[PDB]
Design an enzyme around this catalytic site. Structure first.
Site, PDB file in Angstrom:
ATOM      1  N   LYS A   1       5.923  27.018 -27.690  1.00 21.62           N
ATOM      2  CA  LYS A   1       6.138  28.460 -27.698  1.00 21.62           C
ATOM      3  C   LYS A   1       6.493  28.999 -26.315  1.00 21.62           C
TER       4      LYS A   1
ATOM      5  N   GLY B   1       5.070  21.181 -20.837  1.00 24.87           N
ATOM      6  CA  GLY B   1       4.025  20.652 -19.986  1.00 24.87           C
ATOM      7  C   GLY B   1       2.658  21.275 -20.179  1.00 24.87           C
TER       8      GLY B   1
ATOM      9  N   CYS C   1      -1.819  21.967 -18.210  1.00 25.44           N
ATOM     10  CA  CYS C   1      -1.928  21.127 -17.022  1.00 25.44           C
ATOM     11  C   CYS C   1      -0.773  21.365 -16.061  1.00 25.44           C
TER      12      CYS C   1
ATOM     13  N   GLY D   1      -3.851  22.725 -27.793  1.00 27.89           N
ATOM     14  CA  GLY D   1      -4.494  22.869 -26.503  1.00 27.89           C
ATOM     15  C   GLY D   1      -5.631  23.866 -26.437  1.00 27.89           C
TER      16      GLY D   1
ATOM     17  N   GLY E   1     -13.912  26.333 -11.171  1.00 28.54           N
ATOM     18  CA  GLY E   1     -14.378  27.379 -10.279  1.00 28.54           C
ATOM     19  C   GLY E   1     -14.588  26.893  -8.860  1.00 28.54           C
TER      20      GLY E   1
ATOM     21  N   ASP F   1      -7.126  18.996 -26.124  1.00 29.85           N
ATOM     22  CA  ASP F   1      -8.095  20.067 -25.932  1.00 29.85           C
ATOM     23  C   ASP F   1      -8.476  20.774 -27.227  1.00 29.85           C
TER      24      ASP F   1
ATOM     25  N   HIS G   1     -10.102  -4.930   3.476  1.00 30.69           N
ATOM     26  CA  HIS G   1     -10.789  -4.294   4.594  1.00 30.69           C
ATOM     27  C   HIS G   1      -9.769  -3.821   5.620  1.00 30.69           C
TER      28      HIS G   1
HETATM   29  C1  LIG Z   1      -3.862  -5.462  15.722  1.00 25.73           C
HETATM   30  C2  LIG Z   1      -4.517  -6.147  14.552  1.00 25.73           C
HETATM   31  C3  LIG Z   1      -4.707  -5.444  13.366  1.00 25.73           C
HETATM   32  C4  LIG Z   1      -5.311  -6.045  12.258  1.00 25.73           C
HETATM   33  N1  LIG Z   1      -5.475  -5.303  11.099  1.00 25.73           N
HETATM   34  C5  LIG Z   1      -6.035  -5.883  10.067  1.00 25.73           C
HETATM   35  C6  LIG Z   1      -6.208  -5.106   8.857  1.00 25.73           C
HETATM   36  O1  LIG Z   1      -5.858  -3.940   8.690  1.00 25.73           O
HETATM   37  N2  LIG Z   1      -6.821  -5.805   7.814  1.00 25.73           N
HETATM   38  C7  LIG Z   1      -7.257  -7.127   7.875  1.00 25.73           C
HETATM   39  O2  LIG Z   1      -7.786  -7.626   6.877  1.00 25.73           O
HETATM   40  N3  LIG Z   1      -7.095  -7.840   9.027  1.00 25.73           N
HETATM   41  C8  LIG Z   1      -6.508  -7.243  10.060  1.00 25.73           C
HETATM   42  N4  LIG Z   1      -6.342  -7.962  11.210  1.00 25.73           N
HETATM   43  C9  LIG Z   1      -6.839  -9.342  11.248  1.00 25.73           C
HETATM   44  C10 LIG Z   1      -8.367  -9.412  11.434  1.00 25.73           C
HETATM   45  O3  LIG Z   1      -8.754  -8.797  12.665  1.00 25.73           O
HETATM   46  C11 LIG Z   1      -8.814 -10.873  11.439  1.00 25.73           C
HETATM   47  O4  LIG Z   1      -8.356 -11.528  10.264  1.00 25.73           O
HETATM   48  C12 LIG Z   1     -10.335 -11.022  11.479  1.00 25.73           C
HETATM   49  O5  LIG Z   1     -10.864 -10.347  12.621  1.00 25.73           O
HETATM   50  C13 LIG Z   1     -10.772 -12.469  11.487  1.00 25.73           C
HETATM   51  O6  LIG Z   1     -12.210 -12.520  11.498  1.00 25.73           O
HETATM   52  P1  LIG Z   1     -12.969 -13.764  12.042  1.00 25.73           P
HETATM   53  O7  LIG Z   1     -14.466 -13.442  11.915  1.00 25.73           O
HETATM   54  O8  LIG Z   1     -12.537 -14.975  11.347  1.00 25.73           O
HETATM   55  O9  LIG Z   1     -12.553 -13.852  13.583  1.00 25.73           O
HETATM   56  P2  LIG Z   1     -12.560 -12.807  14.781  1.00 25.73           P
HETATM   57  O10 LIG Z   1     -12.574 -11.432  14.274  1.00 25.73           O
HETATM   58  O11 LIG Z   1     -11.370 -13.157  15.691  1.00 25.73           O
HETATM   59  O12 LIG Z   1     -13.931 -13.099  15.458  1.00 25.73           O
HETATM   60  C14 LIG Z   1     -14.168 -14.292  16.224  1.00 25.73           C
HETATM   61  C15 LIG Z   1     -15.282 -13.986  17.192  1.00 25.73           C
HETATM   62  O13 LIG Z   1     -15.854 -15.197  17.705  1.00 25.73           O
HETATM   63  C16 LIG Z   1     -16.061 -15.062  19.096  1.00 25.73           C
HETATM   64  N5  LIG Z   1     -16.079 -16.397  19.663  1.00 25.73           N
HETATM   65  C17 LIG Z   1     -15.048 -17.295  19.651  1.00 25.73           C
HETATM   66  N6  LIG Z   1     -15.349 -18.453  20.185  1.00 25.73           N
HETATM   67  C18 LIG Z   1     -16.674 -18.313  20.549  1.00 25.73           C
HETATM   68  C19 LIG Z   1     -17.585 -19.195  21.166  1.00 25.73           C
HETATM   69  N7  LIG Z   1     -17.279 -20.443  21.544  1.00 25.73           N
HETATM   70  N8  LIG Z   1     -18.836 -18.743  21.389  1.00 25.73           N
HETATM   71  C20 LIG Z   1     -19.158 -17.502  21.017  1.00 25.73           C
HETATM   72  N9  LIG Z   1     -18.384 -16.584  20.432  1.00 25.73           N
HETATM   73  C21 LIG Z   1     -17.152 -17.055  20.222  1.00 25.73           C
HETATM   74  C22 LIG Z   1     -14.953 -14.130  19.572  1.00 25.73           C
HETATM   75  O14 LIG Z   1     -15.354 -13.490  20.773  1.00 25.73           O
HETATM   76  C23 LIG Z   1     -14.871 -13.151  18.405  1.00 25.73           C
HETATM   77  O15 LIG Z   1     -15.763 -12.051  18.534  1.00 25.73           O
HETATM   78  C24 LIG Z   1      -5.739  -7.373  12.346  1.00 25.73           C
HETATM   79  C25 LIG Z   1      -5.551  -8.085  13.544  1.00 25.73           C
HETATM   80  C26 LIG Z   1      -4.953  -7.479  14.640  1.00 25.73           C
HETATM   81  C27 LIG Z   1      -4.757  -8.264  15.904  1.00 25.73           C
HETATM   82  C1  LIG Z   2      -7.055  25.524 -13.567  1.00 31.65           C
HETATM   83  C2  LIG Z   2      -7.141  24.237 -14.340  1.00 31.65           C
HETATM   84  C3  LIG Z   2      -7.148  23.025 -13.657  1.00 31.65           C
HETATM   85  C4  LIG Z   2      -7.223  21.807 -14.343  1.00 31.65           C
HETATM   86  N1  LIG Z   2      -7.232  20.618 -13.620  1.00 31.65           N
HETATM   87  C5  LIG Z   2      -7.310  19.485 -14.291  1.00 31.65           C
HETATM   88  C6  LIG Z   2      -7.321  18.242 -13.545  1.00 31.65           C
HETATM   89  O1  LIG Z   2      -7.271  18.138 -12.324  1.00 31.65           O
HETATM   90  N2  LIG Z   2      -7.398  17.098 -14.344  1.00 31.65           N
HETATM   91  C7  LIG Z   2      -7.456  17.081 -15.734  1.00 31.65           C
HETATM   92  O2  LIG Z   2      -7.522  15.994 -16.314  1.00 31.65           O
HETATM   93  N3  LIG Z   2      -7.440  18.259 -16.419  1.00 31.65           N
HETATM   94  C8  LIG Z   2      -7.379  19.398 -15.725  1.00 31.65           C
HETATM   95  N4  LIG Z   2      -7.363  20.578 -16.418  1.00 31.65           N
HETATM   96  C9  LIG Z   2      -7.411  20.523 -17.879  1.00 31.65           C
HETATM   97  C10 LIG Z   2      -6.034  20.224 -18.502  1.00 31.65           C
HETATM   98  O3  LIG Z   2      -5.107  21.246 -18.122  1.00 31.65           O
HETATM   99  C11 LIG Z   2      -6.162  20.174 -20.024  1.00 31.65           C
HETATM  100  O4  LIG Z   2      -7.202  19.280 -20.392  1.00 31.65           O
HETATM  101  C12 LIG Z   2      -4.879  19.688 -20.697  1.00 31.65           C
HETATM  102  O5  LIG Z   2      -3.786  20.520 -20.305  1.00 31.65           O
HETATM  103  C13 LIG Z   2      -5.006  19.661 -22.209  1.00 31.65           C
HETATM  104  O6  LIG Z   2      -3.799  19.106 -22.772  1.00 31.65           O
HETATM  105  P1  LIG Z   2      -3.346  19.435 -24.231  1.00 31.65           P
HETATM  106  O7  LIG Z   2      -2.027  18.785 -24.541  1.00 31.65           O
HETATM  107  O8  LIG Z   2      -4.470  19.110 -25.219  1.00 31.65           O
HETATM  108  O9  LIG Z   2      -3.199  21.036 -24.269  1.00 31.65           O
HETATM  109  P2  LIG Z   2      -2.448  22.102 -23.360  1.00 31.65           P
HETATM  110  O10 LIG Z   2      -2.154  21.552 -22.045  1.00 31.65           O
HETATM  111  O11 LIG Z   2      -3.372  23.343 -23.289  1.00 31.65           O
HETATM  112  O12 LIG Z   2      -1.084  22.325 -24.121  1.00 31.65           O
HETATM  113  C14 LIG Z   2      -1.001  23.031 -25.376  1.00 31.65           C
HETATM  114  C15 LIG Z   2       0.400  23.565 -25.508  1.00 31.65           C
HETATM  115  O13 LIG Z   2       0.670  23.964 -26.861  1.00 31.65           O
HETATM  116  C16 LIG Z   2       1.339  25.201 -26.862  1.00 31.65           C
HETATM  117  N5  LIG Z   2       1.059  25.835 -28.129  1.00 31.65           N
HETATM  118  C17 LIG Z   2      -0.165  26.219 -28.602  1.00 31.65           C
HETATM  119  N6  LIG Z   2      -0.135  26.710 -29.818  1.00 31.65           N
HETATM  120  C18 LIG Z   2       1.197  26.619 -30.169  1.00 31.65           C
HETATM  121  C19 LIG Z   2       1.889  26.972 -31.344  1.00 31.65           C
HETATM  122  N7  LIG Z   2       1.316  27.522 -32.418  1.00 31.65           N
HETATM  123  N8  LIG Z   2       3.220  26.740 -31.366  1.00 31.65           N
HETATM  124  C20 LIG Z   2       3.815  26.202 -30.303  1.00 31.65           C
HETATM  125  N9  LIG Z   2       3.263  25.829 -29.149  1.00 31.65           N
HETATM  126  C21 LIG Z   2       1.947  26.064 -29.151  1.00 31.65           C
HETATM  127  C22 LIG Z   2       0.827  25.935 -25.628  1.00 31.65           C
HETATM  128  O14 LIG Z   2       1.760  26.924 -25.208  1.00 31.65           O
HETATM  129  C23 LIG Z   2       0.727  24.780 -24.633  1.00 31.65           C
HETATM  130  O15 LIG Z   2       1.950  24.508 -23.962  1.00 31.65           O
HETATM  131  C24 LIG Z   2      -7.285  21.814 -15.741  1.00 31.65           C
HETATM  132  C25 LIG Z   2      -7.275  23.034 -16.429  1.00 31.65           C
HETATM  133  C26 LIG Z   2      -7.198  24.236 -15.742  1.00 31.65           C
HETATM  134  C27 LIG Z   2      -7.194  25.526 -16.511  1.00 31.65           C
END
Ligand SMILES: Cc1cc2nc3c(=O)[nH]c(=O)nc-3n(C[C@H](O)[C@H](O)[C@H](O)COP(=O)(O)OP(=O)(O)OC[C@H]3O[C@@H](n4cnc5c(N)ncnc54)[C@H](O)[C@@H]3O)c2cc1C
Ligand SMILES: Cc1cc2nc3c(=O)[nH]c(=O)nc-3n(C[C@H](O)[C@H](O)[C@H](O)COP(=O)(O)OP(=O)(O)OC[C@H]3O[C@@H](n4cnc5c(N)ncnc54)[C@H](O)[C@@H]3O)c2cc1C
Lengths: 482, 472
Positions: free
Chosen positions: B35, B40, B43, B147, B188, B318, B450
């Protein structure tokens, strides 16, 4: 107390489990071992716990990625399009770096508290295995401390891989460590290596105003194992942001010049088309490698593999059956969560439990914007292995959450087995890939099907609906909203 | 001339438009009657989409205008709100997505009939258009997806001027100096938070003793309320509204008292938002003539195939029982049409998530602690705070927690409750886990990336399963 054994504390210790290293793998293994009832020692040579990830890795890099993205949103078009009007947006780099350091310091102190809460003995020193059942820690003052221990867990981690002929000085030629603490935005920056680390750090400084070019020997961005379609689409998106790439290019040398700039010589990886690119900062991130220096491995007879990793079996035992190794020092993806999970199951095995980890269920994430994340197998892997699969794709442009935030790059791609509909790989390019890849990892754990996921009631509007719809497309051939 | 159809969908909201698409994809000749001027439903036009857009934009305005961006080294001399521009960004999103539905209808060969639909026979729907013209659809099956509408407050007349529903609150022309919200449910709290962030003095009055509507976990609700209060959102819980008076000067006098009785007072505001609930909409549909009686709350009774008592006439969304959510309506629409095609029809409302898109966000799926207590279930609890999560700490955004409820004996996950950043995306992993009958141990042993916010979901399950997490 006795839970910290620093300089001057040199009495011999008896332990059940001695963990060498306090990175993600080591510190988690230590905590879990203590929670399992083992008398546990963790040896760490650095001033703080947490290893590479906490101190110069995941944490500082994610902090700068977050902050640099927000700077881009405010300084560019995004905030203006939302009615958020600002006279002059200025970067205070010192303050942004301060926010990063605060996060690092809080989490490093958290590990120390967790060690104390769990009664892990923290030995601060350099650990060397001096016998089948003995580790000797050498401390900053020159003192030594002997730990006689039933089991030894090597978690010594990784280091930056050097580029021969290019000297990293963390001044003008930096590793990832220096790039995380630059004192000013460089006018021009060259990144050697378009892997995960290089793309993340390059994007950081690009957002902050640097002219950034990444040079990569291989022909794709994002490191090993990334899906090629995803990688190509990701590269195209980064290029439109201003991030430039010279793929299939080898670096032949770098020269610091009198004016303080750096001339980088490059040519095609196969040879030819030689040119020079000048920059103010050169970031060298061609890889990372296992760190085992002065650990005593040779005397023990533990030989390393050709890439420097410690060979271990499926229980993470080295050839000496009570000496174990996990994390970046062994094979597999060099990731924090991979190290953590290996540490847990290794010590669980020490306590008598089963030891199994599925490396096909270990996710990878690139924390750029858009983010990239994947788990399971790429199309290239399935092809190489002869698997018959089907594809489902769904673009974020058709996702209500992404469209409403005007943040619509990318897609979800799902790979499913033709016959059984089992999810074989999930690949996400776009907003929120971080959290969405974990839903995919849970699905893979159960061997869930594309239909399984499609029939889960995902909240509307969320980015995860794109994951639902890609699985629907993979299972039934068509999505609803695209 | 009449249209012959297999499936005639009345309404184009999340339930109706998705059901229409699915029916066409299955090969049914499908008509969708709407209507309103756009597709859509609630929602897209006056619901999820416009509210989430303003929540996003007002959050970013808060970050730029307040302390957050300065703490990150993003320094700005003067941050100004341009409300017309912020509303334009919202309207742009709505328009793009409404047109997207029209395109999907065309792509899938759904016939779009514009008019007010009335069931005029067991196998006939008549659409009456604004000018009085009619279009008859003779049809095998009818799918009612009409709805919901706003639930009126007795004695208070909404005029969408100074006394508004959610529809009027989504399009205010200026930030009101003072705003009162009747109803501290999901809608709300979301809309109040939008206008609080933009500069309004906002107070929500709620008859019950908690915010966030029905089914929210009480611990979560209390912690959520206190976070919002520290932001400046004021609440009068256990308070009934006795009346509202539109005044000559254009302001509104709201009379309130304690819900139990006593402590009568008057509060003045510039805008009164009435959001005490929503109710099924079935007006002038022809149900009475058909003999389809409504339940006491106005919903259409349906069976497990979503059939009314007339078995070729269906209802979803709904207009029927269950949580009034878009993704719920969508899933009911899909499975109803699958059943028309002969397939199994299944939806588990215990696996349907709820989200509140404030900052921090709130999301949950499964059972609350109060629900488990009422049902006599023996359960255990695992909690993990975002203060101990590395991803949250990297963003310096550390309010809240994940709370997991597990069955004491079997370790089965019974409920997942998230207060904090990224809850809206994290609850979907939780929904998958509940659908699969996951144990807390299952999730604890899945390798989460991680650093991610989802690690708190992992660690809370570990705490529920093994008794202790790693990082807290
Ligand atoms: C810039 C950068 C960004 C990265 N980002 C991510 C990411 O987002 N996600 C992810 O999963 N991985 C990431 N990595 C990889 C992650 O850091 C490594 O995979 C992880 O740290 C390996 O863990 P580990 O415990 O095996 O070794 P390490 O973290 O290298 O720890 C080895 C430790 O043993 C110590 N140690 C060594 N030899 C001796 C010893 N003889 N005696 C005592 N202590 C010793 C060292 O001092 C060190 O503290 C990143 C790496 C770099 C360089
Ligand atoms: C402010 C607000 C925020 C929300 N945020 C979320 C959210 O983040 N996540 C979430 O999951 N839900 C959210 N909701 C709820 C979500 O909008 C509803 O659950 C969802 O839209 C229901 O879907 P529906 O298809 O059952 O009905 P509706 O979306 O209400 O659609 C019904 C449709 O049918 C039409 N219609 C009705 N009667 C007739 C008729 N006789 N002939 C022709 N067309 C007709 C209407 O015009 C309408 O277009 C929110 C609701 C509000 C009000």
């Amino acid at each position: 107390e006795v839970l910290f054994q620093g300089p001057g504390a040199d009495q011999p210790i008896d332990a059940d489990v001695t963990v060498i290293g306090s990175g993600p793998g080591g510190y988690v293994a230590a905590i879990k071992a203590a929670q399992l009832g083992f008398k546990t020692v963790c040896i760490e040579k650095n001033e703080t716990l947490g290893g590479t990830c906490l101190n110069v890795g995941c944490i500082p890099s994610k902090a700068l990625l977050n902050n640099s993205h927000y700077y881009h949103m405010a300084h560019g078009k995004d905030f203006a399009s939302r009615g958020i009007e600002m006279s002059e947006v200025r970067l205070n780099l010192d303050k942004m770096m301060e926010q990063k350091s605060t996060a690092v310091k809080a989490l490093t102190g958290g590990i120390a508290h967790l060690f104390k809460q769990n009664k892990v003995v923290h030995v601060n020193g350099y650990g060397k295995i001096t016998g089948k059942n003995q580790v000797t820690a050498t401390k900053a003052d020159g003192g030594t401390q002997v730990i006689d221990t039933k089991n030894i867990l090597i978690a010594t981690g990784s280091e930056v891989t050097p580029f021969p002929g290019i000297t990293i000085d963390e001044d003008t030629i930096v590793s990832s460590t220096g790039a995380l603490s630059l004192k000013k935005v460089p006018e021009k920056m060259v990144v050697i290596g378009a892997g995960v680390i290089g793309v993340e750090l390059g994007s950081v400084w690009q957002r902050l105003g640097a002219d950034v070019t990444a040079v990569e020997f291989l022909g794709h961005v994002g490191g090993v194992g990334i899906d090629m379609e995803i990688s190509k689409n990701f590269q195209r998106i980064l290029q439109k942001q201003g991030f430039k790439f010279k793929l299939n290019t080898k670096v032949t040398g770098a020269t610091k010049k009198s004016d303080g700039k750096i001339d980088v010589s490059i040519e095609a990886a196969s040879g030819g088309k030689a040119e020079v690119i000048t920059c103010d900062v050169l970031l060298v991130c061609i890889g990372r490698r296992p760190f085992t220096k002065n650990l005593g491995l040779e005397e023990l007879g533990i030989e390393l593999d050709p890439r420097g990793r410690i060979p271990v079996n499926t229980r993470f035992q080295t050839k000496i059956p009570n000496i174990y190794a996990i994390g970046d020092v062994v094979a597999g993806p060099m990731l924090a969560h991979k190290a953590e999970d290996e540490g847990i199951i290794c010590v669980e095995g020490m306590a008598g439990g089963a030891v199994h980890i599925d490396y096909n269920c270990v996710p990878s994430v690139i924390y750029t914007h858009p983010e990239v994340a994947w788990v399971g197998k790429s199309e290239e892997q399935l092809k190489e292995e002869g698997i018959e699969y089907k594809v489902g794709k769904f673009p974020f442009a058709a996702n209500s959450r992404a469209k409403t935030n005007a943040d619509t790059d990318g897609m979800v791609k799902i790979l499913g087995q033709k016959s059984t509909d089992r999810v074989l790989g999930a690949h996400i390019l776009g907003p929120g890939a971080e959290e969405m890849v974990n839903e995919a990892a849970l699905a893979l754990e159960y061997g869930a099907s594309c239909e399984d996921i499609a029939r889960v009631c995902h909240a509307h509007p969320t980015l995860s609906e794109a994951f639902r719809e890609a699985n629907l497309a993979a299972s039934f051939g068509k999505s609803i909203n695209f």
